[PDB]
Design a binder for this molecule. Structure first.
Ligand SMILES: O=C(NCCc1nnc(-c2ccncc2)[nH]1)c1cc(-c2ccc(F)cc2)cc(O)c1O
Ligand SMILES: [Cl-]
Ligand SMILES: [Cl-]
Ligand SMILES: [Mg+2]
Length: 213
């Protein structure tokens, strides 16, 4: 099988159904002790939690679900009725994410979309009944952070105060995105220094709050 399937099986055999915290713990244990994987991890995840709690977003978009770790992390902190839409390019990983969320008991809060961001973002309003997004978590292909931010704006999905939170801005790095948001009067930026998941390598999250045109 694949590493992603092994992670799902480990969760199913080492976590409690309907208990998101136990799911996160199981993933982090597996990826620390058995096989590394590109989940956001607990160090960056704690920063994510602090941001989600500050803003209590009603509608979140995640670009790049992977196995659903971050989706579990965010969805467990959403208020009743709040929703997460998450996009995963790899069909096998999209199916694993769905199963992960089902196991966690968070399936009613989350919609997992299988496809490419450049294709799905323009469909969000009409197909998924989105008006504007409260928060966007960027964790997909690193060379897409900038073009997809611009696409979100073009599509009218950003409002004053929409929070963009971007993983991996140091490793693998997203230099064009960082330069752009930090140099733009349309964003108010903050850097949260941390570590690459499961590693003693510096990474960080960037928060970029959209300010309108
Ligand atoms: O590549 C990464 N994530 C991207 C995952 C994705 N899933 N679906 C989409 C998608 C969805 C719609 N459109 C386009 C792409 N993208 C990624 C890679 C690393 C990493 C770090 C150091 C290494 F040595 C090797 C790899 C770390 C991370 O935290 C990552 O997030
Ligand atoms: Cl993740
Ligand atoms: Cl970690
Ligand atoms: Mg990442």
């Amino acid at each position: 099988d694949t590493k992603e399937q092994r992670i799902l099986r480990y969760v199913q055999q080492n976590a409690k159904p309907g208990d998101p915290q136990s799911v996160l713990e199981a993933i982090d244990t597996y990826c620390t002790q058995k096989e590394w994987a590109m989940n956001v991890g607990d160090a960056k995840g704690q920063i994510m939690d602090a941001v989600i709690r500050e803003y209590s977003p009603s509608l979140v978009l995640e670009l790049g679900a992977y196995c659903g770790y971050s989706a579990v992390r965010m969805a467990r902190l959403l208020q009743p009725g709040a929703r997460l839409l998450t996009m995963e390019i790899n069909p096998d990983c999209a199916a694993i994410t769905q199963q992960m969320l089902n196991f966690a008991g968070l399936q009613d809060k989350v919609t997992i979309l299988n496809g490419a961001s450049q294709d799905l973002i323009p469909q969000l309003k009409k197909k998924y009944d989105v008006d504007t997004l409260d928060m966007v978590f960027l964790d997909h292909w690193k060379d897409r952070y900038l073009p997809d931010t611009l696409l979100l704006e073009k599509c009218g999905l950003l409002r004053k105060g929409t929070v963009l939170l971007a993983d991996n801005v140091i490793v693998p790095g997203t230099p064009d995105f960082l330069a752009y948001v930090r140099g733009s009067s349309s964003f108010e930026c903050t850097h949260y220094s941390s570590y690459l998941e499961y590693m003693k390598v510096v990474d960080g999250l960037e928060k970029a709050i959209y300010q309108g045109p």
